[PDB]
Structure 1
Amino acid sequence: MKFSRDVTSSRRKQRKAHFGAPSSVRRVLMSAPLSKELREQYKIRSLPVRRDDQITVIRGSNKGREGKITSVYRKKFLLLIERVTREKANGASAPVGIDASKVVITKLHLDKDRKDLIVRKGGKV
């Protein structure tokens, strides 16, 4: 149960904030859990998703599909992963968007900002 007077339990307000959040907020919103090995290594439960990230799908029809995040569609809260597509009528390939919470990261895209974020969150590198 929430107690803070600055915390709103209104469903209307919560939905408005979620569906109207800007790109910076949506980046934090689109977060994926780390694998078990990554959890031991970095002492971090989950991180926001990013491009060039190796993930495997846990839910949905494309379960057990390993791939690297090719793009992050924050406008639609979707992740476009490599080789995760479906055939259109004419034979072209249309990528299938996957929610961030439905995938688990198996290999981070390490950089200065990513390492600084991990250390800031209190995790081993």
Structure 2
Amino acid sequence: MKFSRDVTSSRRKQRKAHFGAPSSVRRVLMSAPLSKELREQYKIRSLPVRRDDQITVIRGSNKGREGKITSVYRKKFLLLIERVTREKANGASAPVGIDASKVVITKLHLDKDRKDLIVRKGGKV
């Protein structure tokens, strides 16, 4: 149960906040779990996704697939993973969007900003 009068349990206001969120909020809304190896080595459970991240698809028809994240589609809350495509009528390959919570991060595109993020969120390297 929530006891703060500063947070709303209203489904109307929760749905409006999620679907009307700005880009700097959808960066956090699009978070993915880390693999057990990374999770117990970086001391971090989940991180927001990013391009060049290496992920494994965990749920859906494409379950078990792996690949880098070519681009994150924050408008529709979708990830676009390389070689995870669908053939069209004319044979052109249309990429398939995957929710960020349906993948797991097996390798992190480490940067100084993310390295600072790890030590910030109780992590280590």
User: Does TM, scored on the shorter chain, surpass 0.5?
Assistant: yes
TM tier, smaller: over 0.9
Deviating runs (4+, > 3 A) in structure 1?
none
User: Unpaired segments of 5 or more residues in structure 2?
Assistant: none
Identity among equivalent pairs (%): 100
User: Unpaired segments of 5 or more residues in structure 1?
Assistant: none
Deviation at 1:82, TM superposition (A): 0.3
| TM-superposition CA deviations, 1:61-83 (whole Å, max 9, x none) | 00000100000000110000000
Equivalent-residue separation in structure 2 for 1:11 and 1:90 (angstroms)? 42
Deviation at 1:122, TM superposition (A): 1.1
SS at structure 1 position matched to 2:41 = helix
Using structure 2 for the length normalisation, give the TM-score. 0.99
Deviation at 1:57, TM superposition (A): 0.4
Aligned residues: 125
Using structure 1 for the length normalisation, give the TM-score. 0.99
Q: Which residue of 1 aligns with 2:35?
A: 35
SS at structure 2 position matched to 1:27 = helix
Equivalent-residue separation in structure 1 for 2:22 and 2:118 (angstroms)? 23
| TM-superposition CA deviations, 1:52-104 (whole Å, max 9, x none) | 00000000000000100000000110000000000000000000000000000
Deviation at 1:21, TM superposition (A): 0.6
Equivalent-residue separation in structure 2 for 1:30 and 1:39 (angstroms)? 18
Equivalent-residue separation in structure 1 for 2:12 and 2:38 (angstroms)? 36
SS at structure 1 position matched to 2:52 = coil
After superposition, the CA RMSD in angstroms is 0.4
Q: Which residue of 2 aligns with 1:80?
A: 80
